[PDB]
């Protein structure tokens, strides 16, 4: 909300690289930002690179959205129209250059038809952008890019489109995700630059160290170019948007626990969390449960929302044990965690006998061996 606001002002005072990124729901916040913009700039519906045909360029998809928007504003009420499809035609004609796996020499003469010389798809696209701004009476175009969490490998194409096509004074990139994800892709396709023969021969410690040192330098040099840190947003967390132990509470939330909750019974978020932790864990209101809920406040927002929209709902079902009600929820919530831990996944095997071995194994990975049976959130592993 508030971060969305400051972000809006940040973009607006930007047109007077040109990419803003959001570290991480995340899509919810990005949609908030976009609709906030609905000092004239025309924005596009956010692109889900994870929901696009396996092979296509973000440039083509953006061109398609541009086409729709232009036809819409243009069918609203020429001469802009016709020259527009002209840029369309040049772009379509010179586009092979990207997809093409082989350089057909016949493209040479096409490389020979006419201020820099050639078929620079970047310059065609930038003249396109000028056309779009002029036709829409807009200072520039906001371009939006969704997380690639479910498919982190497509983001390369977006990054490359940014570098080779969106170095323009009239386009504003707005991407979302975690920088480490992009860091992997940079890592991977830096490595894919060496020669396989080099890789499989010059493989001693010194050479590997120098190679990796160079590759990391390139990581840092390129990511800085792509993502101006000043153009970086922090994505406030839910616990930081709430009192740490009551001495805080930036933007109190309050949540509805039963179906009715007539906007007055909404039982906070922190207090209900501590309540569920105490009852389903039988913990009292001391200091150990508060720390636990603090280490529940740093988990994924979707994770927490489901963990506390499944527990109380089935409680309402039952009311027309608290620990079993809540342990069921944890079962699915950390379910991936638990099975990756190599622990009881069979529901009808919970008992005391499986639970003792499970605790022993859990400590065996937690190392500890001194207070593990506390099972308190003290481990580095987020699982």
């Amino acid at each position: 909300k508030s971060l969305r606001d400051q972000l809006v002002e940040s973009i607006r005072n930007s047109i007077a690289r040109n990419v803003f990124f959001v570290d991480g729901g995340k899509t919810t916040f990005i949609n908030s930002v976009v609709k906030s913009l609905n000092v004239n700039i025309k924005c596009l519906p956010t692109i889900d690179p994870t929901k696009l045909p396996r092979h296509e360029p973000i440039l083509v998809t953006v061109t398609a959205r541009l086409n729709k928007m232009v036809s819409d504003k243009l069918k609203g009420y020429r001469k802009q129209k016709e020259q527009w499809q002209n840029h369309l035609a040049q772009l379509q004609r010179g586009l092979h250059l990207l997809t093409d796996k082989e350089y057909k020499p016949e493209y040479f003469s096409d490389a020979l038809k006419l201020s820099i010389g050639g078929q620079d798809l970047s310059e065609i696209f930038e003249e396109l952008v000028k056309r779009a701004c002029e036709i829409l009476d807009c200072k520039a175009i906001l371009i939006t890019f969704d997380d690639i969490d479910t498919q982190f490998d497509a983001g390369w194409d977006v990054l490359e489109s940014i570098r080779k096509f969106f170095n323009s004074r009239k386009l504003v990139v707005v991407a979302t995700g975690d920088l480490r994800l992009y860091s992997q892709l940079i890592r991977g396709k830096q490595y894919e630059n060496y020669s396989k023969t080099l890789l499989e021969q010059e493989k001693e410690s010194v050479r590997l160290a120098e190679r990796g040192y160079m590759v990391e330098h390139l990581e840092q040099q390129y990511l800085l170019k792509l993502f101006p840190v000043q153009k970086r947003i922090q994505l406030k967390t839910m616990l930081q948007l709430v009192g740490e132990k009551g001495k805080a509470g930036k933007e109190e939330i309050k949540v509805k626990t039963e179906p009715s909750m007539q906007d007055i019974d909404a039982i906070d978020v922190r207090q209900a969390i501590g309540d569920a932790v105490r009852e389903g864990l039988n913990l009292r209101e001391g200091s150990d449960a508060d720390m636990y809920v603090n280490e529940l406040l740093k988990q994924p927002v979707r994770l927490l929302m489901q963990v506390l929209q499944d527990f109380y709902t089935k409680k309402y079902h039952a009311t027309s044990s608290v620990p079993n009600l809540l342990r069921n929820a944890l079962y699915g919530s950390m379910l991936s965690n638990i099975y990756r831990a190599g622990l009881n996944y069979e529901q009808h095997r919970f008992g005391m006998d499986s639970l003792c071995k499970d605790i022993f194994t859990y400590v065996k990975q937690d190392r500890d061996f001194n207070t593990g049976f506390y099972l308190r959130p003290q481990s580095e592993s987020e699982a």
Binding site: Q83, Q90, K113
Partner: protein
């Protein structure tokens, strides 16, 4: 004589070569026409051509037209076609002559001109044109015809193939050059246009596309885009687009119909 004004490689060459603002060129026509007829209808006795051209220009001046396809087509339509019973039809005595001409030119423009200057009683384009005779029509109705030998151009009429080329220009190129190496078509090309070559083949094709685009713009009567002013030399139309002032302007414009290359 008319046919030479619409079918002449030399005329094409001269017109394309000379600038668009030249004017006062009717000599280039009279000379080029005497040439083209010399090549094609060599047998004419050196004075009949002169007299025919003279009478043609005579008619043009008398009827107060400018030498050009407007006047030519108007003459051809008034001379050949009439409005008769159903759609315009052609004179029986002149039919063979019409065919001799169709050996050289396309009907569609003449057809449109006849509709314009002599529409029938208040039609859908249909090729080819026909004369009329009630008995023959009754026979055809009662028995219909039976097509037994149709394999010339696939099985289609060419005028559609030209539109097809404009639809797939690159493809007709491909076909041309692949065969241009074959000797036979080299001789055919030389015999038809000596300086034909695939290069000017492409040039003429893309130029014709340009012309149809621009003339369609004006046919819709649309505010006559500025770049026509820069457009000064027909060879400027040998490119997919044109440069007015730093900007490069294409020729595509919106046409009412979807089949942009339709005969209709």
């Amino acid at each position: 004589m008319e046919r030479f004004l619409l079918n002449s490689t030399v005329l094409l060459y001269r017109l394309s070569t000379v600038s668009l603002d030249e004017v006062s060129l009717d000599e280039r026509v009279e000379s080029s026409v005497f040439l083209a007829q010399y090549e094609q209808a060599r047998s004419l006795p050196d004075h009949v051509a002169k007299s025919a051209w003279s009478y043609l220009v005579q008619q043009i001046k008398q009827r107060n037209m400018k030498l050009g396809p407007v006047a030519i087509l108007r003459l051809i339509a008034e001379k050949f076609i009439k409005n008769e019973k159903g759609g315009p039809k052609i004179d029986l005595p002149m039919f063979s002559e019409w065919q001799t001409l169709m050996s050289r030119v396309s009907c569609l423009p003449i057809i449109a001109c006849h509709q314009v200057f002599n529409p029938g009683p208040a039609y859908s384009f249909r090729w080819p044109l026909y004369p009329y005779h009630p008995t023959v029509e009754d026979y055809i109705t009662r028995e219909c015809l039976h097509e037994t030998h149709q394999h010339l151009n696939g099985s289609t009429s060419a005028e559609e193939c030209w539109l097809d080329a404009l639809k797939h220009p690159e493809a007709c190129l491909r076909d041309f050059e692949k065969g241009w190496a074959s000797q036979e078509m080299k001789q055919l090309c030389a015999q038809i246009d000596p300086s034909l070559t695939p290069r000017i083949f492409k040039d003429r094709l893309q130029i014709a596309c340009n012309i149809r685009e621009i003339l369609c713009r004006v046919a819709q009567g649309v505010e006559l885009p500025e770049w026509i002013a820069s457009m000064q030399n027909p060879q400027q139309l040998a490119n997919s687009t044109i440069l007015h002032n730093g900007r490069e302007y294409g020729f595509a414009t919106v046409w009412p119909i979807d089949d942009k290359y339709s005969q209709e």
